[PDB]
Scaffold this active site. Structure first.
Site, PDB file in Angstrom:
ATOM      1  N   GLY A 137      78.354 -11.764  11.393  1.00  0.00           N
ATOM      2  CA  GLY A 137      77.963 -12.332  10.119  1.00  0.00           C
ATOM      3  C   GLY A 137      77.775 -13.840  10.140  1.00  0.00           C
ATOM      4  O   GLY A 137      76.641 -14.318  10.040  1.00  0.00           O
ATOM      5  N   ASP A 138      78.862 -14.593  10.261  1.00  0.00           N
ATOM      6  CA  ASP A 138      78.775 -16.056  10.264  1.00  0.00           C
ATOM      7  C   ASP A 138      79.200 -16.715  11.573  1.00  0.00           C
ATOM      8  O   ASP A 138      79.534 -17.897  11.575  1.00  0.00           O
ATOM      9  CB  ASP A 138      79.645 -16.689   9.161  1.00  0.00           C
ATOM     10  CG  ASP A 138      79.240 -16.280   7.752  1.00  0.00           C
ATOM     11  OD1 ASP A 138      78.033 -16.126   7.480  1.00  0.00           O
ATOM     12  OD2 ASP A 138      80.155 -16.137   6.910  1.00  0.00           O
TER      13      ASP A 138
HETATM   14 CA    CA Z   1      74.609 -13.937   9.103  1.00  0.00          CA
HETATM   15 CA    CA Z   2      79.795 -16.187   4.736  1.00  0.00          CA
HETATM   16 CA    CA Z   3      76.394 -15.975   6.336  1.00  0.00          CA
END
Ligand code: CA
Ligand code: CA
Ligand code: CA
Ligand code: NA
Ligand code: NA
EC number: 3.1.-.-
Lengths: 151, 151
Positions: free
Chosen positions: B17-18
């Site tokens: 995700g991040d």
């Molecule tokens: Ca992402």
């Molecule tokens: Ca995030």
């Molecule tokens: Ca993100």
DNA sequence: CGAAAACGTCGTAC
DNA sequence: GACGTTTTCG
DNA sequence: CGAAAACGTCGTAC
DNA sequence: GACGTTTTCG
């Protein structure tokens, strides 16, 4: 629809990253209290990675993928399956666990929220809480605005 | 430093995700081939949620958190512990699994890459690969760039 | 020198 | 990411 | 009406 | 998210 633990652990982290657990008070005369409570569980991703979102549709077995240009989103709003899904994911979330609990609580409360104008307004209070928890930046319809329901 | 499976499954999803798995060819005369190979495992997050990055430092037991204004990053660049960590996290990645493998492969290959100019350049090719896989947008130093070392 | 830390910033993909 | 408004559906 | 789908877009937090 | 450049450290 009961999911696999490895999957939920992985997904909870993916959600804490690019997901969103959203509650909205939507204005509309058609509704008894002139506003509809709406709930959404969503996962966003660049459209070239859309296959990933598609695979969510396959494993969760409900929900759908919408496209909005260079970006797409997996969307789940149906109250029953959403509640079923969130319940199972809730134990693994770290960043969006509270908003997951709040949505679960809002769902369980919908029946009696149609009943009185005060129960409805209280539930709206729970959606204010969910937005405060979120990195909210363009919210318009608040529980406070629904309170101008006073006649 | 052998990690707990539940923890890896969750972090693998957060990283997809991040997170970011990064390989860079950094220019500098001090180095034998006028470039240093650098590898970085990072997780980015808004500074009001920096506790979450601090919790990673605690569980991984290595790495650190840097602050860059309104945002911060958990950073892990030490070759030995990064290799150890990526090997265990790698099997659960779904979006950055290939770049994780390439980094493992680059790390295993560093010793012999100092030896010949051709091996070094080949390794640089793998970092071009990782950047292709990433959502790269401001890359300057390429394997091609290094090739102008030609005397 | 070699390797990591420190510091800084562009352009989206959330 | 996290809202917004508008249209369908039952 | 009630509830979800469809469609659209602001402002960062990656 | 994914790079860049500059400084430290051994
Ligand atoms: Ca992402
Ligand atoms: Ca995030
Ligand atoms: Ca993100
Ligand atoms: Na907030
Ligand atoms: Na790419």
């Amino acid at each position: 629809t009961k999911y696999n633990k490895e999957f939920l652990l992985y997904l909870a982290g993916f959600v804490d990253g690019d997901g969103s657990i959203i509650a909205q008070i939507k204005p509309n005369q058609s509704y008894k209290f002139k506003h509809q409570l709406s709930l959404t569980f969503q996962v966003t991703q660049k459209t070239q990675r859309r296959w990933f979102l598609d695979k969510l549709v396959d494993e969760i077995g409900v929900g759908y993928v919408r496209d909005r240009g260079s970006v797409s989103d997996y969307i789940l709003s149906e109250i029953k399956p959403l509640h079923n899904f969130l319940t199972q994911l809730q134990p693994f979330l770290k960043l969006k666990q509270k908003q997951a609990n709040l949505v679960l609580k809002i769902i369980e409360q919908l029946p009696s929220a149609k009943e009185s104008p005060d129960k409805f307004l209280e539930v709206c209070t729970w959606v204010d809480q969910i937005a405060a928890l979120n990195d909210s930046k363009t919210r318009k319809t608040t529980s406070e605005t629904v309170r101008a329901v006073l006649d």
